[PDB]
Ligand binder design. Structure first.
Ligand SMILES: *[C@@H]1O[C@H](CO)[C@@H](O)[C@H](O)[C@H]1NC(C)=O
Ligand SMILES: *[C@H]1O[C@H](CO)[C@@H](O)[C@H](O)[C@H]1NC(C)=O
Lengths: 99, 125, 274, 8, 122
């Protein structure tokens, strides 16, 4: 009945420091639907973070995309702090250029 | 603890008259693994020795089978819509009786479907 | 080609933080064209595809009513299920359900279905015979009977064979073209140094539609199914989709491998190499 | 189109 | 049956009881470009139900264990000198009483070894 979330922190368009882009945070394979998705820049949470509406799959598991505008730097850190009941501790996944 | 495909077979059980076209479909859920392989565990055996039947790509219509005790005449398989891999048996003979089940490989880990009985229909009538 | 109309509904209860939420989303060829979230500012049905905005106010009123009507009846179902399973009142539970029909390339009905799922696990479903039910446990057995001794399979079958295929055409008429659209993948391989003289090559594939795609690495004509490592096809956020499949190879001997990209939007599969 | 669900 | 890919399994039967370390070596003779996989079936397996155990890449040094057996491993693995793959069980607790066999895929063809019942005799 329970399923553990699957996260991916990536950008819409190819990464390029200095150029404005969009950072996605695709969470999938989680049940129940109760999920908390935060997007942080250098530790601090980001303000305008739009979140796609929720929708599950034939395997009954849910998924949802969350993005927010950002401008890549070679020294700026980006991560997605996701909170979910099947997770003993709120997993914080970091953005990896090559992923 | 990443992704894990989901194999669904249909039907879960079956049996028939010596001589019928048995078609078994395998539905793979997930984009974490392409293609599909159909396995078989011969009914006649004490030790669970799986036997590779066939492999099908999720893209190309190219199928890779096994040239062993050339059974090319009783085995036939195609690929349908939504990750649907069909495996039909040409004439359910005695050499076909056994347990069938599909497998797939995602990020090096092998996943297996619940086995599906394909024995002779209660041998009655 | 084949087409299919389906509806994914969700009625999740959650005591302690508001009433139960009810969402109703429909799909045409696996593409969301309609929705309804009880949590919305103005809870009502709304189009998800441009080609859906043609339908007038009369259409959206009928659907909103249906959702408003179901949303209520599903709230009881959550309570009804509390007793069938005898669970307390505090632990959120959730009931989901997928129901629709599949139409063959010829236009005929390939199959009609309906699957219920309580707390992520299967509950009850309409058989392929479109007349019988298949309960998963004893709780379903009650519903099964309740529906049998009521004439449910006939009414559901009537909708699966009537409403479903009929309106399937409707939407499909002004939505097929846009659904058949294709954006070829923008591929390329990446180089990554690894310990012990190896090297990992990542076959990228971005901005493609539809989401279906297959990337396979090969060596001397052999698909490296097990030596491979790919990711879940993720939405780029602009209608397009991304994905990548890598494989570890020995340094220097890096140009002996190639990943073949197979996508609907390609007349011929691509062959990338570092 | 949208279906009217039955009680469990 | 030359250059044709095929695996050898040793030991071919173990009636060994509770307590013993057990090294199951797989000799892959042929041209397998992929790695070696270890599979078996025990308790909650009344019907032929194989469950992936471990995968050993041939090429580089990367090993992928079961999606769960990952924590509190009762199994061990390592690549032995020349075409060898050894799946060694730590303690023969009931948690691993069944039939084992390694598998290799060559040109999209699953090639299995021979099912070895490292069981008991009681
Ligand atoms: C054992 O299996 C082989 C391979 O599938 C098949 O050809 C043969 O008919 C089976 N023999 C018996 C006695 O079940
Ligand atoms: C058999 O072993 C499997 C795999 O190691 C383990 O998960 C399961 O608990 C075992 N079952 C019994 C009844 O010993």
């Amino acid at each position: 009945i329970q399923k553990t979330p699957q996260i991916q922190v990536y950008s819409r368009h190819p990464p390029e420091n200095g150029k404005p882009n969009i950072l996605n945070c695709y969470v999938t394979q989680f049940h129940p639907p109760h999920i908390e998705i935060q997007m942080l820049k250098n530790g601090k949470k980001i303000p305008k973070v739009e979140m796609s509406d929720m929708s599950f799959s034939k395997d009954w598991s849910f998924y949802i995309l969350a993005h927010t505008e950002f401008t890549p730097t070679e020294t700026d850190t980006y991560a997605c702090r996701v909170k979910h009941d099947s997770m003993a501790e709120p997993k914080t996944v970091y953005w990896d250029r090559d992923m | 603890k990443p992704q894990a495909p989901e194999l669904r077979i249909f039907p879960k059980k079956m049996d028939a008259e010596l001589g019928q076209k048995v078609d078994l479909v395998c539905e793979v859920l997930g984009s974490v693994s392409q293609g599909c392989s159909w396995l078989f565990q011969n009914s006649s055996s004490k030790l669970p020795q799986p036997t590779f039947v066939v492999y099908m790509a999720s893209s190309h219509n190219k199928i890779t089978w096994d040239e062993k005790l050339n059974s090319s005449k009783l085995f036939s398989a195609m690929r349908d819509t939504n990750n649907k891999y069909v495996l039909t048996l040409n004439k359910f003979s005695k050499e076909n009786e056994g347990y069938y089940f599909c497998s797939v490989i995602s990020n090096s880990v092998m996943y297996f479907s619940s086995v599906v009985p394909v024995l002779q229909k209660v041998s009655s009538a | 080609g084949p087409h299919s109309l389906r509806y994914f509904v969700t009625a999740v209860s959650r005591p302690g933080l508001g009433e139960p939420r009810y969402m109703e989303v429909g799909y045409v060829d696996d593409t969301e064209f309609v929705r309804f979230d009880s949590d919305a500012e103005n809870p009502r049905y709304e189009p998800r595809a441009r080609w859906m905005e043609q339908e007038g106010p009369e259409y959206w009123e009928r659907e909103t009513q249906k959702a408003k009507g179901n949303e209520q009846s599903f709230r009881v179902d959550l309570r009804t299920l509390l007793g069938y399973y005898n669970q307390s009142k505090g632990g959120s539970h959730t009931i989901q359900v997928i129901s629709g029909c599949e139409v063959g390339s010829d236009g005929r009905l390939l199959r009609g279905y309906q699957q219920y799922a309580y707390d992520g696990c299967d509950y009850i479903a309409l058989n392929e015979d479109l007349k019988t039910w298949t309960a998963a446990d004893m709780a379903a057995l009650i519903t099964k009977h309740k529906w049998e001794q009521a004439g449910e399979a006939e009414r559901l079958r009537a909708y699966l064979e009537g409403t479903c295929v009929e309106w399937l055409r409707r939407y499909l008429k002004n939505g097929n073209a846009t659904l058949l659209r294709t954006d070829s993948p923008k591929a390329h391989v990446t180089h990554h140094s690894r310990p012990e003289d190896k090297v990992t090559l990542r076959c990228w594939a971005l901005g493609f539609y539809p989401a279906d795609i297959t990337l396979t690495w090969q060596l001397n004509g052999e698909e490296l199914i097990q030596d491979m490592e790919l990711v879940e096809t993720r939405p780029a956020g602009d209608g397009t989709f991304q994905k990548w499949a890598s494989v570890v190879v020995p340094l220097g001997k890096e140009q002996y491998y190639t990943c073949h990209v197979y996508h609907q939007g390609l007349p011929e599969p691509l062959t990338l190499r570092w | 189109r949208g279906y009217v669900y039955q009680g469990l």
